[PDB]
């Protein structure tokens, strides 16, 4: 293949192979699931488990603003850069208007930022995908961004390694998400995340992060200590 070595090279069939490679990079990251309810959005992130004594920690879920947060999958450095950019833009907006940025405008800004790096010769696409969970006057929002620059407005979605199982599970309970309560939404997200784990690994607090955003709930991250309420009692019943 002589059309995949550059970003400003079109394939003869009308393809951009570097962006496809970045999508492949996103497809190899840790699995994460986003679920949108009537008033709440819940993200579930599958972090690395310890090797029987050695617990490694890596920050995947970020808090962007009082009403916004996101989960990354893929290149962690690209996710950090995108988090810094989003936090700066949120701080700029809240300074000018004394209110949080609307989620649609935010998604447009992330899309434009992604597109800025897919057309210049001295640039490369972000090898990371994002799940944006937020709340504004228009209600709950759940977005997914890809290295190509496309932003998808989702009722429920998943991304990462072996996330097709999570997606096909969510495709059976998503139409009821508008009626499930917060606890039911968390259980659905946890089941979707568990559908993406390996054979011999069951979900537990050591290897799962739970992010929640709502109407009166600022974007809150839930980890080892605070995740006891949602993960201590939980098991996949086939």
């Amino acid at each position: 293949n002589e059309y995949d070595s550059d970003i400003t090279t079109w394939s003869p069939t009308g393809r951009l192979f570097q962006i496809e490679y970045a999508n492949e990079a996103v497809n190899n990251g840790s699995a994460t699931v986003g679920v949108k309810g009537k008033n709440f959005v819940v993200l579930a992130a599958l972090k690395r488990s310890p090797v029987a004594e050695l617990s490694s920690y890596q920050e995947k879920v970020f808090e962007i603003d009082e009403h916004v947060g996101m989960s990354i999958s893929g290149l962690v450095a690209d996710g950090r850069v995108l988090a810094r950019y989003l936090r700066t833009e949120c701080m700029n907006y809240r300074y000018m208007y004394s209110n949080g940025m609307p989620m649609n405008q935010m998604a447009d800004m992330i899309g434009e930022k992604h597109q800025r790096h897919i057309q210049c010769s001295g640039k490369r696409p972000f090898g990371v995908g994002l799940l944006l969970a937020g709340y504004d006057r228009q209600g709950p929002h759940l977005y997914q961004t890809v290295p190509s620059g496309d932003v998808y407005d989702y009722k429920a979605t998943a991304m990462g390694v072996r996330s097709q199982a999570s997606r096909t599970y969510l495709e059976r309970h998503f139409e009821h998400f508008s009626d499930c309560t917060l606890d039911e939404l968390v259980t659905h997200a946890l089941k979707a995340l568990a559908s993406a784990t390996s054979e011999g690994i069951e979900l537990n607090v050591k290897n799962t992060t739970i992010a929640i955003v709502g109407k009166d709930t600022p974007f809150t991250i839930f980890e080892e200590e605070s995740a006891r309420k949602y993960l201590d009692g939980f098991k996949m019943r086939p």
Partner: protein, 235 residues
């Protein structure tokens, strides 16, 4: 070779330059790190090129601040830039906030410097290549003893016991056993010395390795002298 650019993606999704810089780490000396409630221990293999070299002139463990140390593996020439940047950022944090800078923040600054590589000039001069250095930053802060690991990709990861360099997989295999949450400082030191023994082609001598300790109770960094290393061995 210049067939591919420095920002190109592999068909598997990996950046070629970053993956090539990772293989340079495995060609370097072995470095260790142990986190325990009593403190954090850094160990490193010196691998001097000759017996005429002054062993103190090739310090594999450098002091970022009085509570933060850093041990490198790979290309020591590039590691000096990272350690200097970390020192400058820690001093800036002390200047601005009148408090010691956290280990995680120092690692964040190091990775922030590391990620700034590319080829497009434009407005800012970037590095022509990523750093061929993996850093292991140890320290004591308000969250107790903390150990972090830095990659050429610019990704920081908090660890309980991590090893970098040539003897990495064997050290990890030893890590799977013989390690727990609540080892004492002496037990961690002996574990580090034994792991260096297991992955060293040369014979272990007090002047052959470098050991440093950041104590939880003291809160300060303490470089170990060859007699202290011998005392560790004589146990």
């Amino acid at each position: 070779e210049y067939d591919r650019g420095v920002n190109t993606f592999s068909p598997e999704g990996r950046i070629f330059q970053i993956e090539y810089a990772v293989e340079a780490i495995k060609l370097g000396s072995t470095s260790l790190g142990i986190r325990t409630p009593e403190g954090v221990v850094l160990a490193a293999e010196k691998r001097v090129p000759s017996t005429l070299v002054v062993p103190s002139s090739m310090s594999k463990i450098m002091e970022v601040d009085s509570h933060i140390a850093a041990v490198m593996s790979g290309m020591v020439a590039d590691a000096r830039i990272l350690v200097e940047h970390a020192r400058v950022e820690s001093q800036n944090h002390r200047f601005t906030y009148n408090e010691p800078m956290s280990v995680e923040s120092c690692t964040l600054a190091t990775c922030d410097l590391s990620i700034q590589f590319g080829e497009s000039g434009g407005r800012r001069k970037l590095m022509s290549r990523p750093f061929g250095v993996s850093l292991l930053i140890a320290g004591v802060d308000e969250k107790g003893p903390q150990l972090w690991q830095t990659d050429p990709s610019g990704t920081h990861t908090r660890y309980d016991a991590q090893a970098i360099g040539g003897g990495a997989e064997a050290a990890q295999s030893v890590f799977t056993e013989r390690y727990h949450r609540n080892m004492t400082l002496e037990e961690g030191e002996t574990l580090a010395v034994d792991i260096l023994k297991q992955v060293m082609e040369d014979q272990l001598s007090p002047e052959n390795i470098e050991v440093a300790v950041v104590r939880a109770d003291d809160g300060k960094l303490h470089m170990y002298t060859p007699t202290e290393i011998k005392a560790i061995m004589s146990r």
